[PDB]
Symmetry: C2
Subunit: 359 residues, 2 copies
Amino acid sequence: MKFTVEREHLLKPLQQVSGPLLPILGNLLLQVADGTLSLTGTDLEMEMVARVALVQPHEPGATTVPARKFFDICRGLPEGAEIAVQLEGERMLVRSGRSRFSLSTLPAADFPNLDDWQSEVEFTLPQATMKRLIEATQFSMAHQDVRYYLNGMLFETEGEELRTVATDGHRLAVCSMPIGQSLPSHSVIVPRKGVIELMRMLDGGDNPLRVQIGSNNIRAHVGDFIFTSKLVDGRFPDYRRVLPKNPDKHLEAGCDLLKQAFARAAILSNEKFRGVRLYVSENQLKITANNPEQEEAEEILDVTYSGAEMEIGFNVSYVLDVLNALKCENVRMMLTDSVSSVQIEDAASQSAAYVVMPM
Amino acid sequence: MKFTVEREHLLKPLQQVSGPLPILGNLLLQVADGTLSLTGTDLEMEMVARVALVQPHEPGATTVPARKFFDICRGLPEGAEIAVQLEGERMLVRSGRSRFSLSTLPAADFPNLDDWQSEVEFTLPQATMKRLIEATQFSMAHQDVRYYLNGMLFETEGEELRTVATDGHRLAVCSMPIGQSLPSHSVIVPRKGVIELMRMLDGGDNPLRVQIGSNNIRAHVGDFIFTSKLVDGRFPDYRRVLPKNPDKHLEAGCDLLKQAFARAAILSNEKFRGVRLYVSENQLKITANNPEQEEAEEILDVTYSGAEMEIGFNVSYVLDVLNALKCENVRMMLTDSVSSVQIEDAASQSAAYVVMPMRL
Ligand SMILES: O=C(Cn1c2c(c3cc(Br)ccc31)CC[C@@H](C(=O)O)C2)N[C@H](Cc1ccccc1)C(=O)O
Ligand SMILES: O=C(Cn1c2c(c3cc(Br)ccc31)CC[C@@H](C(=O)O)C2)N[C@H](Cc1ccccc1)C(=O)O
Ligand SMILES: [Ca+2]
Ligand SMILES: [Ca+2]
Ligand SMILES: [Cl-]
Ligand SMILES: [Cl-]
């Protein structure tokens, strides 16, 4: 196995396949075949593969090398460096300028593969749309809940919409985006680590994303990268049951102003329970907080509200999470009563919605 | 006690006094003779910041939680007016339609440092003190049992001020002339105190006044006064570890040398970090290997005319020096494989670094 490639063509591929990395799981599989260098990283649950065209002379073969060390070596070389690689006995030699390195290898035959599987559902969409869908909801996934199905994100196809749902039992985020293709009605759960990796592969360019879903796997092709993950078992909740049936009390306020006020009130909220109370009245919102030391905060804001007066408590962190996710001018809070969830949205888009349980 | 002040006139003061019993998590606030004073302490050191009060005020003193008070003021909007008044056991804070009631502890209970007399004094520019500390800070020990190493030596001699730091393995020294006749004296400043001193300096046009006592040090700059205890101990003599008449001077661009060392370091022993240098006519070869028998080699052009030699060093210590230097070219002053190396900015002898030889 031999290849010579410019540093600039290896960096991002190495970054992508090595980021999240059986000592052999700490290695990258390298394969030179048919004028292509393939780089693969896996943790047995998911896999990233990068392809890199080889325009200079090369020789076929495969090996595995320590991912972090190989990446750090390549990153450490100067801009414009050309990196010559060749296998020599048990070691992989890496040469650039008068910098030389000899890395240990493990046999390519030992590198684990995911099970083969069939694609049942496919569609393509812009990168910017997948980014939007993931960023809108990702913060609301559970982290290590014993309900394993919540440690991850729902990807649902319906009509021509792709929808993501994330919830941890206390708060929920949902976002739907049209993708201009007839889709079957289908849902899968992607594990939270796979969601993060998928997000990280979205470079910001105009390369479209191709998605393939099987019964136990999801795959995403973007540019010269292929990401594959297993799915999570279990019955995900139905976001329509979490959305308030009829939250017909509508409050509108500046996002930044609202966030600032909550963030200040939070300072004097209970350090564990983070409770704040909201008093809504005609064109006015009052937020209060207090803690076991009897310290107290009060914020009063102008808002647009024409409904009945009411009072409700929330965990302020959950609300701040939403407002930070929104990135918009004005927010709409949609209320039911003092003992029911609240729905929050961008006042100028219903494309994402957030639900927070009351305290 | 009452005052009203612009948010932006409190932020810097609040940053500075938060730097140093639960009253130690409070700040002492005092309104007197046109001035708000804020004090934070950890009983070892203390910072006092003064804010001029141009709006109506009323005298008095209290203490409030530092983190919460600082967070409220920082969270308030740009340009906000902050009105504070003491209401019984609470301190009330208001600005626009935001109101806060904070718990207080009596000012009477706020601890003072022991009184002391100044014995050595001098004034220098902030940039000079900043250079002195930054040049050497990284070589101070952290929680070493030799408590006298967990800090920095400040030494006055003639018209110069010198700092020394060492952890028992490597050493940094920096000396700057400060244009005033000083007694020959030295003290050890605790590492936490060094960091706080460093951070009180903005590099601006206010002169820094330093006062040293038997057991304390104080630094006054503009509206801020820092006071710390000294470390009551004996510091090692830096002159003892400086190599005698090193006659083999290697010179190279700092960044090229640094990047070579950083790449080589990847395949060095994770715990002991040894790398080898082979010096020859205008050439440096650096090698590294690890227990798994992986190997790195770097060859660079340098300026070097001395006898050929080999020497090993801890690459983390060498990289620490190169990162602190932030200069164009470096000088490595070599002697032989069993002697230390002295490293300097090629264009300046004001800072010097000593690293020990490793056998491999
Ligand atoms: O009992 C539930 C019901 N539930 C649930 C979810 C959810 C989402 C929102 Br925004 C509000 C309530 C939700 C989503 C996850 C559902 C599940 O267990 O599969 C249960 N959640 C509690 C928290 C809770 C307790 C009492 C009242 C409301 C919420 C929990 O997950 O620990
Ligand atoms: O004193 C020491 C250990 N030591 C010590 C210090 C020191 C600083 C540097 Br840059 C390098 C070595 C240091 C400073 C702290 C000394 C102490 O224990 O108080 C020990 N070693 C000498 C050997 C030696 C001689 C000359 C120069 C360096 C080291 C010995 O054990 O006799
Ligand atoms: Ca705006
Ligand atoms: Ca929606
Ligand atoms: Cl270099
Ligand atoms: Cl070596």
